Design a protein around this ligand. Structure first.
Ligand code: NAI
Ligand code: NAD
Ligand code: 37Z
Lengths: 475, 475
């Protein structure tokens, strides 16, 4: 039957029971051993309560707030007998504060985003940099520096951020192998970074194309997506952000750097979900992606940084999201930005509504000798329905990643605060791959300068096709 | 009991039998007296032939080219017994040359676009300026100066260009009534221009929202539209163009003017269908439109120009398209520009495939004492099917405009080369209105500054809400 990877010897506290929580619960029940009364879900939504009740799980209908999270979570996470697991799959809660709470009390932790307490994302009195994922991530890195070691807490371990970090490692190994480069795999951050440098990887797109669609057309004045609408709009309205490669010779006028932190990123003074980049996936071939800020855009570029003895970065790949969401979400963005306000209503397409499609999600490594290499999942809604309940393909890539992170955390429970880039990528993918559908590596000769210049003057660098100058849409 | 307006006692030569030809023929049959054998349809496609044969109409399966159009069309236009009518609804043919040919042979002429011979729109040797609708229109104006008066030829008399010119006049009349401006209704171009100036009309959007959708979702790698795909893509890849108002205080860096001609327009060095503008319609409320070049953008601005004794323009409204096509077309544009090439295939949604929706098409007059006024048609597909065969709502707005133009031409056959702006707008709308569904005027307090600036610094002009600086979306 299904593998049972581990016994959880304590409370399992799932915060949030939206599209991801709903998809993750069945995997937790499937793959871990524990008494049913150990698991409890926390979510303020009536919709969520009704679904939870239907699934026969304990449910606390409460919003976790700055004011109550200590009083609520400390007792639940320390119920016993042994180590509990905080599975944080929420919006509007502080990943940092909850993470630190769990660690203080010896509870394992995992989430899929560095979320802030409600009132951050759309605070007009915060400058764009202060609303950046770069900034949010730095609070986690600072927490790690302040308290090294201790109980394992896994930050940003969903599909992307999360799984894609493992894909990058696998892709690097595949590229090397395809070039006839043999020998031991890297085992340290420094060795991974040097592998990327040595193979001449100039940059990386998180290259995604979601082709899922419903039996009904997009309703007017309704934002439609295959996962969190609130979450997508939140990051969509954050500044465009990207890990910034050492090979880049140009940046936009409204690009800005950071005075502090790991040094791996820049941001643009414009919303990422209204910023387009030229990208590519196997099924989409050439496409527009949206340059939506994402944790991995920074974490991957940071991870793969090579520094000299003075500590100056000598190599680093460009890294960023190039997101083509489902067609109804594309229309939803057009509608939202076109009106200058969020729609009156929203909905997440679920399994019962989606007629066909895949969530093609992978990493596009470019600039090396074989030009460009896409590695990732082509999971279809059809396969999803066969192998996991209560979610679509988008949800399953995420929930299975949380599963992998949980297994890893349980197996490595004294590793301290860790990112997806810190995990054993082979073990994680071993656990996750049964839920990822086709996992393939594809080379292409496409570049951002394909068919260019066109009928109008363009600001392009023909000496280096993958320069951000050629990727960013400026029309 | 449909009205039969006039007898056409000469040959009726329809060039092109696509979506508009198919919608227009039955209106010609319905509203004109003539012997059915004197109608001839010319179109190179097999699809066209089979539709024409099904209607028992004489058909010539030939592409009209610069090499054959004289020897092909002259005998058809002059067949007698009386004055013929060339109804040009084609692509890839020269409106100018065919128009001049008709005029030379005493035949009436009408079309819906200043189309060039095949090889013009995507000619890499042409400068962007030469590819502009401004330039193409100047060839018609030059033809009129060279041969003033004579047989009537109606240039660009579809829905837009065409009908919307009449909408502008009606809107100006309504606005004057609502604003308490007293006087005789204008009866010359000078008086119309003066009225617009006196009412304080800063600019005009051709503000359109097409909500038609089919029983099937958009297919991958197929461009979908509700009218000509070839036609729409052609103008979509022409430079963005607009009639340029005297009130404008700013233009983008890649804006350019013209050294000669009527002087009413500028163009941008970027494709119009990948240029977004902030606009508004009654059903859409605030929306993105695409700044696709259109003849009326220049012709309306030119028509409403006030000049001093020296010949300098002292008033002129901004005028341009703000097009939100059907959702499948929005997706098609995203797909096309995203891949950097036209889709492998295309289809026009017809009356058998469309489930619901309207083509909300009107003119948005702004800058005056009541901020903004939208006047136009909200024709639905349901209403369309009730009153006209073989076309969707988009097609009927066009075909009925051609009908009106044809009635006008027959009633004024010695008026020379004329634009929609030169026609008796009341007579034309009298003929067209039965086919336009609700025709309404709607005020709004919305402006392009509404809700701005947001979370990011924006390059706006807070002093004058309707400045192009605020309307244009700047990637
Ligand atoms: N890294 C990745 O690949 C992905 C990450 N995510 C993230 O995971 C989180 C969940 O995503 P979805 O389940 O799709 O979102 P969703 O919008 O479907 O559900 C979010 C849930 O959080 C609940 N919630 C709101 N305020 C709360 C509070 N104060 N305390 C507890 N719960 C609260 C809501 O009631 C809702 O049920 C989001 O933060 C999202 O950004 C989502 C998908 C992919
Ligand atoms: N002003 C307006 O409101 C308006 C709106 C819609 C379309 N139009 C214009 O009307 C024209 C027709 O639109 P449509 O939707 O019917 O287009 P369509 O693409 O459906 O049909 C065009 C037809 O032209 C024919 N054709 C191609 N080359 C030809 C040639 N050399 N000689 C004769 N025929 C040829 C094709 O076979 C096709 O049947 C286009 O130029 C379009 O831009 C104007
Ligand atoms: N803040 C959440 C962002 C991470 C992406 N989340 C959802 C997955 C959608 C794309 N697979």
């Amino acid at each position: 039957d299904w593998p049972v990877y581990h016994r959880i010897d304590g409370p399992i506290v799932m915060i949030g029971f939206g599209s991801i929580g709903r998809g993750t619960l069945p995997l937790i029940e499937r793959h871990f051993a524990f008494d049913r009364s150990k698991l409890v879900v926390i979510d303020p939504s009536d919709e969520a309560r009704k679904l939870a009740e239907a699934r026969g799980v304990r449910f606390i209908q409460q919003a976790v707030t700055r004011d109550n999270y200590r009083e609520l979570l400390v007792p639940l996470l320390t119920a016993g007998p042994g180590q509990g697991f905080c599975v944080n799959l929420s919006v509007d809660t502080s990943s940092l504060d909850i993470m630190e709470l769990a660690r203080e009390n010896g509870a394992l932790y995992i989430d899929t985003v560095v979320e802030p307490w409600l009132g951050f994302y759309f605070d007009p009195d915060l400058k764009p940099e202060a609303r950046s994922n770069y900034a949010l991530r730095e609070t986690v890195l600072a927490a790690r520096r302040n308290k090294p070691g201790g109980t394992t807490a896994v930050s940003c371990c969903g599909a992307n951020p999360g799984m894609v970090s493992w894909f990058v490692k696998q892709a690097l190994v595949n590229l090397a192998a395809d070039l006839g480069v043999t020998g031991e795999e890297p085992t340290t951050r420094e060795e991974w970074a040097r592998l990327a440098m040595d193979l001449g990887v100039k940059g990386i797109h998180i290259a995604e194309r979601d082709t899922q669609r419903a039996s009904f057309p997009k309703p007017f004045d309704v934002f439609v997506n295959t996962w969190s609408v609130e979450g997508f709009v939140s990051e969509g309205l954050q500044p465009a952000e990207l890990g910034w490669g050492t090979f880049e010779r140009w940046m936009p006028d409204n690009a800005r750097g950071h005075d502090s932190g790991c040094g791996a990123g820049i941001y643009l003074l414009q919303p990422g979900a209204n910023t387009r980049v030229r990208s590519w996936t196997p099924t989409a071939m050439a496409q527009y992606g949206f340059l939506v800020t994402h944790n991995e855009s920074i974490s991957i570029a940071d991870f793969l940084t090579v520094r000299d003895a003075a500590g100056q970065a000598v190599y680093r790949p460009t890294c960023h999201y190039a997101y083509h969401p489902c067609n109804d979400a594309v229309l939803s963005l057009h509608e939202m930005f076109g009106s200058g306000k969020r729609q009156s209503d929203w909905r997440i397409l679920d399994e019962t509504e989606i007629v066909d499609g895949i969530d093609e999600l992978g990493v596009l490594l470019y600039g090396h000798g074989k030009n460009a290499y896409w590695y990732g999942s082509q999971l279809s809604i059809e396969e999803t329905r066969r192998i996991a309940p209560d979610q679509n393909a988008t949800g399953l890539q995420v929930s299975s990643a949380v599963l992998a992170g949980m297994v890893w955390a349980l197996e490595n429970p004294n590793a301290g605060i860790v990112e997806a880039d810190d995990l054993d990528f082979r073990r994680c993918l071993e656990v996750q791959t049964p839920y990822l559908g086709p996992v393939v590596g594809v080379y292409t000769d496409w570049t951002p300068l394909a068919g260019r210049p066109g009928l109008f003057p363009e600001d392009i660098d023909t000496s280096d096709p993958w320069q951000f100058r050629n990727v960013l849409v400026r029309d």
